[PDB]
Design an enzyme around this catalytic site. Structure first.
Site, PDB file in Angstrom:
ATOM      1  N   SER A 189      19.023  58.141  -0.612  1.00 42.06           N
ATOM      2  CA  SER A 189      17.952  58.368   0.345  1.00 42.06           C
ATOM      3  C   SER A 189      18.105  57.444   1.544  1.00 42.06           C
ATOM      4  CB  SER A 189      16.604  58.093  -0.331  1.00 42.06           C
ATOM      5  OG  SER A 189      15.574  57.877   0.633  1.00 42.06           O
ATOM      6  N   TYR A 224      11.002  52.713  -5.767  1.00 38.88           N
ATOM      7  CA  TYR A 224      11.974  53.760  -5.469  1.00 38.88           C
ATOM      8  C   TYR A 224      13.073  53.223  -4.538  1.00 38.88           C
ATOM      9  CZ  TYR A 224      13.760  58.065  -3.213  1.00 38.88           C
ATOM     10  OH  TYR A 224      14.553  59.046  -2.682  1.00 38.88           O
ATOM     11  N   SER A 225      12.673  52.523  -3.473  1.00 43.07           N
ATOM     12  CA  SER A 225      13.653  51.991  -2.515  1.00 43.07           C
ATOM     13  C   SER A 225      14.597  50.965  -3.133  1.00 43.07           C
ATOM     14  CB  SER A 225      12.971  51.406  -1.274  1.00 43.07           C
ATOM     15  OG  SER A 225      13.928  50.793  -0.437  1.00 43.07           O
ATOM     16  N   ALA A 226      14.032  50.071  -3.935  1.00 39.27           N
ATOM     17  CA  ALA A 226      14.806  49.097  -4.707  1.00 39.27           C
ATOM     18  C   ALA A 226      15.900  49.750  -5.575  1.00 39.27           C
ATOM     19  CB  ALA A 226      13.862  48.256  -5.587  1.00 39.27           C
ATOM     20  N   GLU A 266       9.061  71.051  -3.033  1.00 44.18           N
ATOM     21  CA  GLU A 266       7.643  70.991  -3.374  1.00 44.18           C
ATOM     22  C   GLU A 266       7.184  69.567  -3.695  1.00 44.18           C
ATOM     23  OE1 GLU A 266       5.549  72.623  -7.016  1.00 44.18           O
ATOM     24  OE2 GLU A 266       5.244  74.306  -5.628  1.00 44.18           O
ATOM     25  N   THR A 267       7.974  68.853  -4.500  1.00 45.35           N
ATOM     26  CA  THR A 267       7.648  67.478  -4.909  1.00 45.35           C
ATOM     27  C   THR A 267       7.525  66.510  -3.726  1.00 45.35           C
ATOM     28  OG1 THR A 267       8.721  67.873  -7.064  1.00 45.35           O
ATOM     29  CG2 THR A 267       8.167  65.615  -6.531  1.00 45.35           C
ATOM     30  N   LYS A 320      17.283  52.772  -5.185  1.00 45.02           N
ATOM     31  CA  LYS A 320      18.253  53.445  -4.298  1.00 45.02           C
ATOM     32  C   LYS A 320      19.210  52.472  -3.586  1.00 45.02           C
ATOM     33  CE  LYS A 320      17.258  57.924  -4.846  1.00 45.02           C
ATOM     34  NZ  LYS A 320      18.004  58.713  -5.901  1.00 45.02           N
ATOM     35  N   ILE A 364      13.414  66.058   2.617  1.00 40.60           N
ATOM     36  CA  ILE A 364      13.823  67.420   2.247  1.00 40.60           C
ATOM     37  C   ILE A 364      12.618  68.209   1.721  1.00 40.60           C
ATOM     38  CG2 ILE A 364      15.474  68.819   0.889  1.00 40.60           C
ATOM     39  CD1 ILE A 364      16.807  66.816   2.941  1.00 40.60           C
ATOM     40  N   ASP A 365      12.539  69.493   2.087  1.00 44.75           N
ATOM     41  CA  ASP A 365      11.341  70.320   1.850  1.00 44.75           C
ATOM     42  C   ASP A 365      11.126  70.826   0.417  1.00 44.75           C
ATOM     43  OD1 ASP A 365      12.520  73.408   3.531  1.00 44.75           O
ATOM     44  OD2 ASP A 365      13.162  72.445   1.668  1.00 44.75           O
TER      45      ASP A 365
HETATM   46  N1  LIG Z   1      13.093  65.632  -1.372  1.00 47.54           N
HETATM   47  C1  LIG Z   1      13.280  64.663  -0.478  1.00 47.54           C
HETATM   48  O1  LIG Z   1      12.539  64.594   0.701  1.00 47.54           O
HETATM   49  C2  LIG Z   1      14.314  63.614  -0.719  1.00 47.54           C
HETATM   50  C3  LIG Z   1      14.608  62.660   0.266  1.00 47.54           C
HETATM   51  C4  LIG Z   1      15.557  61.674   0.000  1.00 47.54           C
HETATM   52  C5  LIG Z   1      16.200  61.663  -1.239  1.00 47.54           C
HETATM   53  N2  LIG Z   1      15.906  62.605  -2.185  1.00 47.54           N
HETATM   54  C6  LIG Z   1      16.588  62.577  -3.487  1.00 47.54           C
HETATM   55  O2  LIG Z   1      17.036  63.868  -3.884  1.00 47.54           O
HETATM   56  C7  LIG Z   1      17.000  63.968  -5.311  1.00 47.54           C
HETATM   57  C8  LIG Z   1      16.215  65.196  -5.791  1.00 47.54           C
HETATM   58  O3  LIG Z   1      15.012  65.310  -5.059  1.00 47.54           O
HETATM   59  P1  LIG Z   1      13.895  66.472  -5.270  1.00 47.54           P
HETATM   60  O4  LIG Z   1      12.860  66.276  -4.233  1.00 47.54           O
HETATM   61  O5  LIG Z   1      14.575  67.776  -5.384  1.00 47.54           O
HETATM   62  O6  LIG Z   1      13.243  66.057  -6.675  1.00 47.54           O
HETATM   63  P2  LIG Z   1      12.489  66.993  -7.746  1.00 47.54           P
HETATM   64  O7  LIG Z   1      12.338  68.353  -7.163  1.00 47.54           O
HETATM   65  O8  LIG Z   1      11.184  66.423  -8.142  1.00 47.54           O
HETATM   66  O9  LIG Z   1      13.468  66.986  -9.020  1.00 47.54           O
HETATM   67  C9  LIG Z   1      13.685  65.851  -9.816  1.00 47.54           C
HETATM   68  C10 LIG Z   1      14.447  66.358 -11.034  1.00 47.54           C
HETATM   69  O10 LIG Z   1      14.686  65.313 -11.970  1.00 47.54           O
HETATM   70  C11 LIG Z   1      14.152  65.662 -13.247  1.00 47.54           C
HETATM   71  N3  LIG Z   1      13.540  64.498 -13.915  1.00 47.54           N
HETATM   72  C12 LIG Z   1      12.388  63.828 -13.569  1.00 47.54           C
HETATM   73  N4  LIG Z   1      12.195  62.819 -14.457  1.00 47.54           N
HETATM   74  C13 LIG Z   1      13.207  62.834 -15.360  1.00 47.54           C
HETATM   75  C14 LIG Z   1      13.507  62.047 -16.467  1.00 47.54           C
HETATM   76  N5  LIG Z   1      12.724  61.032 -16.830  1.00 47.54           N
HETATM   77  N6  LIG Z   1      14.638  62.327 -17.210  1.00 47.54           N
HETATM   78  C15 LIG Z   1      15.469  63.375 -16.861  1.00 47.54           C
HETATM   79  N7  LIG Z   1      15.168  64.153 -15.756  1.00 47.54           N
HETATM   80  C16 LIG Z   1      14.056  63.887 -15.025  1.00 47.54           C
HETATM   81  C17 LIG Z   1      13.132  66.766 -13.000  1.00 47.54           C
HETATM   82  O11 LIG Z   1      13.037  67.665 -14.082  1.00 47.54           O
HETATM   83  P3  LIG Z   1      11.966  67.439 -15.265  1.00 47.54           P
HETATM   84  O12 LIG Z   1      10.642  67.016 -14.683  1.00 47.54           O
HETATM   85  O13 LIG Z   1      11.805  68.720 -16.055  1.00 47.54           O
HETATM   86  O14 LIG Z   1      12.530  66.344 -16.139  1.00 47.54           O
HETATM   87  C18 LIG Z   1      13.667  67.449 -11.758  1.00 47.54           C
HETATM   88  O15 LIG Z   1      14.548  68.496 -12.112  1.00 47.54           O
HETATM   89  C19 LIG Z   1      16.394  62.665  -5.826  1.00 47.54           C
HETATM   90  O16 LIG Z   1      17.433  61.784  -6.214  1.00 47.54           O
HETATM   91  C20 LIG Z   1      15.651  62.143  -4.611  1.00 47.54           C
HETATM   92  O17 LIG Z   1      15.425  60.759  -4.653  1.00 47.54           O
HETATM   93  C21 LIG Z   1      14.974  63.578  -1.944  1.00 47.54           C
HETATM   94  C1  LIG Z   2      13.477  60.172   3.219  1.00 39.74           C
HETATM   95  C2  LIG Z   2      12.321  59.422   2.605  1.00 39.74           C
HETATM   96  C3  LIG Z   2      12.534  57.941   2.847  1.00 39.74           C
HETATM   97  O1  LIG Z   2      11.115  59.989   3.164  1.00 39.74           O
HETATM   98  C4  LIG Z   2      10.095  59.070   3.418  1.00 39.74           C
HETATM   99  C5  LIG Z   2       9.339  58.556   2.380  1.00 39.74           C
HETATM  100  C6  LIG Z   2       8.332  57.655   2.636  1.00 39.74           C
HETATM  101  C7  LIG Z   2       8.074  57.276   3.935  1.00 39.74           C
HETATM  102  F1  LIG Z   2       7.084  56.391   4.196  1.00 39.74           F
HETATM  103  C8  LIG Z   2       8.816  57.790   4.978  1.00 39.74           C
HETATM  104  C9  LIG Z   2       9.826  58.692   4.720  1.00 39.74           C
HETATM  105 CL1  LIG Z   2      10.745  59.317   6.047  1.00 39.74          CL
HETATM  106  C10 LIG Z   2      12.349  59.685   1.121  1.00 39.74           C
HETATM  107  O2  LIG Z   2      13.289  59.375   0.397  1.00 39.74           O
HETATM  108  N1  LIG Z   2      11.216  60.300   0.669  1.00 39.74           N
HETATM  109  C11 LIG Z   2      11.139  60.755  -0.692  1.00 39.74           C
HETATM  110  C12 LIG Z   2      10.319  62.027  -0.818  1.00 39.74           C
HETATM  111  C13 LIG Z   2       8.842  61.753  -0.587  1.00 39.74           C
HETATM  112  C14 LIG Z   2       8.341  60.728  -1.590  1.00 39.74           C
HETATM  113  C15 LIG Z   2       9.128  59.437  -1.418  1.00 39.74           C
HETATM  114  C16 LIG Z   2      10.607  59.700  -1.655  1.00 39.74           C
HETATM  115  C17 LIG Z   2      10.779  60.217  -3.075  1.00 39.74           C
HETATM  116  C18 LIG Z   2      10.020  61.531  -3.245  1.00 39.74           C
HETATM  117  S1  LIG Z   2      10.265  62.192  -4.881  1.00 39.74           S
HETATM  118  C19 LIG Z   2      12.002  61.954  -5.140  1.00 39.74           C
HETATM  119  O3  LIG Z   2      10.069  63.629  -4.840  1.00 39.74           O
HETATM  120  O4  LIG Z   2       9.548  61.368  -5.832  1.00 39.74           O
HETATM  121  C20 LIG Z   2       8.543  61.267  -3.001  1.00 39.74           C
HETATM  122  C21 LIG Z   2      10.508  62.555  -2.228  1.00 39.74           C
END
Ligand SMILES: NC(=O)c1ccc[n+]([C@@H]2O[C@H](COP(=O)([O-])OP(=O)(O)OC[C@H]3O[C@@H](n4cnc5c(N)ncnc54)[C@H](OP(=O)(O)O)[C@@H]3O)[C@@H](O)[C@H]2O)c1
Ligand SMILES: CC(C)(Oc1ccc(F)cc1Cl)C(=O)N[C@@H]1[C@@H]2C[C@@H]3C[C@H]1C[C@@](S(C)(=O)=O)(C3)C2
Ligand SMILES: NC(=O)c1ccc[n+]([C@@H]2O[C@H](COP(=O)([O-])OP(=O)(O)OC[C@H]3O[C@@H](n4cnc5c(N)ncnc54)[C@H](OP(=O)(O)O)[C@@H]3O)[C@@H](O)[C@H]2O)c1
Ligand SMILES: CC(C)(Oc1ccc(F)cc1Cl)C(=O)N[C@@H]1[C@@H]2C[C@@H]3C[C@H]1C[C@@](S(C)(=O)=O)(C3)C2
Ligand code: NI
Ligand code: NI
Ligand code: NI
Ligand code: NI
EC number: 1.1.1.146
Lengths: 275, 275
Positions: A160, A173-175, A211-212, A177, A208-209
Site C-alpha cells: 500500500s 496496518y501501516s506498520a 467494497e471493503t 505494510k 482501490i474501489d
Molecule cells: N482496496 C484498497 O483501497 C487498497 C489500497 C491499498 C492496498 N490494498 C491491499 O490490497 C489487498 C486486498 O485488498 P481488498 O480491498 O481487496 O481487501 P478485501 O476485499 O477485504 O479482501 C481481503 C481478503 O483477505 C481475506 N482474509 C481476511 N482475513 C483473513 C484471515 N484472517 N485469514 C485468511 N484470509 C483472510 C478475506 O477473505 P475472508 O474474510 O473470507 O477470510 C478477503 O478475501 C490487501 O493486501 C490490501 O491491504 C488495498
Molecule cells: C491507499 C490507502 C493508504 O488509502 C488511504 C487510507 C487511509 C487514509 F487516511 C488515506 C488513504 Cl489515501 C490504503 O491503503 N487504504 C486502505 C483501504 C481503506 C482502509 C485503510 C486501508 C486498508 C483498507 S482494508 C485492506 O480494506 O482493510 C481499509 C482498504
C-alpha cells in the site's frame, strides 16, 4: 489456430507482457474470496493458469473456483482457513503445491480486517495486524520457497501507499505494510548473493474501489478510487515481468512521489562495494 | 554561581541545545544495561535528570544506577524484566512514573538479540523481533501516554539505517525497524490533528561501536563505526529539541541519502489538503 492480422504490434529492441506468460503456470492467490484477490484469480483463470485460492469463507471460495473454471483455468482449487493460524499457512502451501504438482507464483494479498480510527489502547489489533498482514506472508514464503526455487518462480507481495509513506488512522496496518518492505526487500538482496532465482514484487497501491475499502473510507476520506479489475491485472503483470516494485494509483503525481531514488542509490552503493 | 566569561556564544534569531533542558526531567531509558542505552543513562545523569533504567540483567542495572547517582542524577532507579513480557512492559512504566512522580521522556532503545545471517526457516526470530523490537514499544507508549500528555513530553524511538533502506543478513531486524517508522510516523500525524502535544523522535543510526554490534559484524562487514558515547548524546539532543528524525552515521553521504524529500512532499500534500 487463426490470427488477427489487423491488430497492431510495436517495434523494439525487447520485452512486454503477454497472457501466455501465465498459461499453465501454477499460482496461489491468498485473500481471494473478494476484492483484488478475487479479481486476480479471475485474470489468472482467463490466462489458463492453475490456481489455488484461499481465505476463511469456503462458500464464497467455491464460487470463485467455479467461475475460475468457467473462464478457462487449467485447474482451480480452494483450501479454506485463517492466516492467523501459522500451521494452516504452512500446510496450505504444501497442500496447494501437491494439488498443482508445483508452484510458479505466490500471490500474497490477504489482510486482517481494518478500519480508520485514531490509535489508543488497541494493542490486539496491532499484534493481529503484524501476525496476519506480515508474519503469515513470511511463513507462506518459507513453505513455498523450495517449489519456487525449482521453477525459478515469483513471490508477489501486495502492499500500500501506507507501506511507503505515513498516514493517520491506519497506524497498525501501516506498520505491517512497512514491515513487508523491510523484510522482503532484504531477502531480495540475500537471494541476489546466494543465487536464488526467485523474484519478489512489492506492490504499492493507492485507494482501490473494493467494497471493503469504499466502506472503510466513507465519510472520512474524499478521494478517487482506482478500479479493482485493472489493479488486479497490473499486479499480475508486474510479478510476471519479475519487477521489484509495482505502483498503481488514480494519481500520477502520487506514483511519482512514492519512488525513492535516494534509497535506490544508497543500496546501489552498498552492492557496488560488494561487487 | 560563577560563569565562564571566556567561553564563546553564538548570535541568532533563535534555538540550540542546552543540558538544562533535561535538568529535573523524568526519563525512562530501555535497554540501558549496556551500549547506547547505558551511555544515554549516563548523559542524562550528568544533566541532573531523574532516570528509570530497565533491561533483563538486574546486577548490571544496579551498577548503571550507582554510576548515574555519582554523575549527578536527580534520582536513579532500575526495574528488571524482559520486553518479551508485555504485562511487564505495561507495569514497568506505571512503576517508573510512580518512582519519579511523572514522565517527561520515554526513550525506547532495546532490541532482541540479533546476528548477521541469511534468512531461511527462523520464523521464531522474526516473531520475537516483531514482539520485542516493535510491539513492546507500542505497549510502553500506550502505558506512558497519559503521563506524557500531562508534561507535554517526548517519545524517542531508536531505529537504524536498516529501518529506512534494505540490507541483506538482517531481514527480521529490518522488518521490525521499518514497522517502527510506519507506526510512530502515523501516530505523530494523529497527535497533530487530535492536539496531543507529545513529540516523537525516530533515530536513524548507522553502525555504532558497541561491543554487541562490533561482535555481530566481525569478519562480515568492514566499515567505520561511530562512537557510542556521542551517538547517545545526539539521540538525547534530538528528542529534547522535539525533532521528528535524527540521523547519525560515520558518513555524511549516508546521512544525505537516507532523507526522503519525496515522502515529506507527499505527506505535506495530504496535510495541506486537510489544512
Ligand atoms: N482496496 C484498497 O483501497 C487498497 C489500497 C491499498 C492496498 N490494498 C491491499 O490490497 C489487498 C486486498 O485488498 P481488498 O480491498 O481487496 O481487501 P478485501 O476485499 O477485504 O479482501 C481481503 C481478503 O483477505 C481475506 N482474509 C481476511 N482475513 C483473513 C484471515 N484472517 N485469514 C485468511 N484470509 C483472510 C478475506 O477473505 P475472508 O474474510 O473470507 O477470510 C478477503 O478475501 C490487501 O493486501 C490490501 O491491504 C488495498
Ligand atoms: C491507499 C490507502 C493508504 O488509502 C488511504 C487510507 C487511509 C487514509 F487516511 C488515506 C488513504 Cl489515501 C490504503 O491503503 N487504504 C486502505 C483501504 C481503506 C482502509 C485503510 C486501508 C486498508 C483498507 S482494508 C485492506 O480494506 O482493510 C481499509 C482498504
Ligand atoms: N550498535 C549499532 O551499530 C546500531 C546501529 C543501528 C541501530 N542501533 C540501535 O541502537 C539500539 C541499541 O544498540 P546497542 O548496540 O547498544 O545494543 P546492546 O548493547 O546489545 O543493548 C541492547 C539492550 O537491550 C536489552 N535487552 C535485550 N533483550 C531484551 C529483552 N528481551 N527485554 C528487555 N531488554 C532487552 C539489553 O539488556 P539485557 O540483555 O540485560 O536484557 C541491552 O541493555 C538498538 O535499538 C539498536 O537496534 C544500533
Ligand atoms: C547500521 C546497520 C544497518 O549496520 C549494518 C548491519 C548489517 C549490514 F549488512 C550492514 C550494516 Cl551497515 C545496523 O543497524 N547494524 C546493527 C548492528 C550490527 C548487527 C545488525 C544490526 C543490529 C545489531 S544488534 C542491535 O547489536 O543486534 C547487530 C547491531
Ligand atoms: Ni480470435
Ligand atoms: Ni499496444
Ligand atoms: Ni565552572
Ligand atoms: Ni558553539
Amino acid at each position: 489456430q487463426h490470427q488477427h492480422q489487423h491488430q497492431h504490434q510495436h517495434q523494439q529492441p525487447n520485452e512486454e507482457f503477454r497472457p501466455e506468460m501465465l498459461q499453465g503456470k501454477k499460482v496461489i492467490v491468498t485473500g481471494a474470496s473478494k476484492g483484488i484477490g478475487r479479481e486476480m484469480a479471475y485474470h489468472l483463470a482467463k490466462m489458463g493458469a492453475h490456481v489455488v485460492v484461499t481465505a476463511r469463507s469456503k462458500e464464497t471460495l467455491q464460487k470463485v473456483v467455479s467461475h475460475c473454471l468457467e473462464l478457462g483455468a487449467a485447474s482451480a482449487h480452494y483450501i479454506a482457513g485463517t492466516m492467523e493460524d501459522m500451521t494452516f499457512a504452512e500446510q496450505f502451501v504444501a497442500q496447494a503445491g501437491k494439488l498443482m504438482g508445483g508452484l510458479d507464483m505466490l500471490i500474497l494479498n490477504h489482510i486482517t480486517n481494518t478500519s480508520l480510527n485514531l490509535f489508543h489502547d488497541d494493542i490486539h489489533h496491532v499484534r493481529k495486524s503484524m501476525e496476519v498482514n506480515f508474519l503469515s506472508y513470511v511463513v507462506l514464503t518459507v513453505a513455498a520457497l523450495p517449489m519456487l526455487k525449482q521453477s525459478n518462480g515469483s513471490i508477489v507481495v501486495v502492499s500500500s501507499l501506507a507501506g511507503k509513506v505515513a498516514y493517520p488512522m491506519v497506524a497498525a496496518y501501516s506498520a505491517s505494510k512497512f514491515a513487508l518492505d523491510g523484510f522482503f526487500s532484504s531477502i531480495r538482496k540475500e537471494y541476489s548473493v546466494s543465487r536464488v532465482n526467485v523474484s519478489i514484487t512489492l506492490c504499492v497501491l493507492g485507494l482501490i474501489d473494493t467494497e471493503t475499502a469504499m466502506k472503510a473510507v466513507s465519510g472520512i476520506v474524499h478521494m478517487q478510487a482506482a478500479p479493482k479489475e485493472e489493479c488486479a491485472l497490473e499486479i499480475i503483470k508486474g510479478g510476471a515481468l519479475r519487477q521489484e516494485e509495482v505502483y498503481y494509483d488514480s494519481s500520477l503525481w502520487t506514483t511519482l512521489l512514492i519512488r525513492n531514488p535516494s534509497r535506490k542509490i544508497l543500496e546501489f552503493l552498498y552492492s557496488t562495494s560488494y561487487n
